[PDB]
């Protein structure tokens, strides 16, 4: 999926708690996607080279 998003927010010397809430929402999403982007390609690469193996063995 892909919503129009405009990540990025400005705060001042006096709204630092918020700015840190915003920080963790981001880091939070980073750690999530990075992990799934990786295991996805990893496990999908696994299965794809078995497909091919499975395929000649069928021949």
């Amino acid at each position: 999926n892909t919503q129009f998003t405009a990540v990025g927010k400005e705060f001042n010397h006096l709204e630092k708690r918020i700015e840190n809430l915003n920080k963790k929402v981001d880091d939070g999403f980073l750690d999530i996607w990075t992990y799934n982007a990786e295991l996805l390609v990893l496990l999908e690469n696994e299965r794809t080279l078995d497909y091919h193996d499975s395929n000649v063995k069928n021949l």
Binding site: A6, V7, G8
Partner: protein
């Protein structure tokens, strides 16, 4: 959409105050004391500064963004130089907005060689709405406003990267 227009024109709408002695070195142009183009530092006509009471109705199709300032002078000495009356107040009013300001007179660490300060405010008068100004000194009135449609859904890039 974003059209900038002049509501309170530097000529007609300021009969009883000085429309162009409102100028400081903090804001130089041509190496010569000037000021903002959209505001207008209304000072005392002669030895007078009557109650000013200007209103504007938003007839433009969209909503209009209005900015103004409140001037806090370094000392009682120049509060009088600028506006004669020592106790003053500004009052912006509107269907939704509404705040009475009172100038805080004190000496703050020189900045841009300035021991006084100016606070800037904004507010969005929606279509059909009126908005009253009213003052006895210390107001920095609008010259220009901005009518606009926002899709108010985006952000700011801060970068040294070229535009193409």
């Amino acid at each position: 959409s974003f059209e900038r227009f002049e509501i309170f024109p530097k000529t007609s709408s300021w009969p009883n105050h000085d429309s162009n002695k409102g100028v400081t070195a903090a804001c130089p142009h041509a190496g010569a004391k000037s000021f903002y183009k959209n505001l207008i530092w209304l000072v005392k006509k002669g030895n007078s500064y009557p109650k000013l009471s200007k209103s504007y109705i938003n007839d433009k199709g969209k909503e209009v963004l209005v900015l103004w300032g409140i001037h806090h002078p370094s000392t009682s000495a120049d509060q009088q130089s600028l506006y004669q009356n020592a106790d003053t107040y500004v009052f912006v009013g509107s269907s939704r907005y509404s705040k009475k300001f009172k100038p805080e007179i004190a000496i703050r660490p020189k900045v841009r060689d300035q021991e006084g300060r100016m606070n800037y405010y904004w507010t969005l008068v929606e279509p059909g709405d009126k908005i009253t100004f009213e003052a006895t000194g210390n107001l920095v009135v609008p010259r220009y406003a901005f009518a606009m449609e926002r899709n108010a859904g985006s952000g700011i890039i801060i970068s040294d990267t070229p535009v193409h």
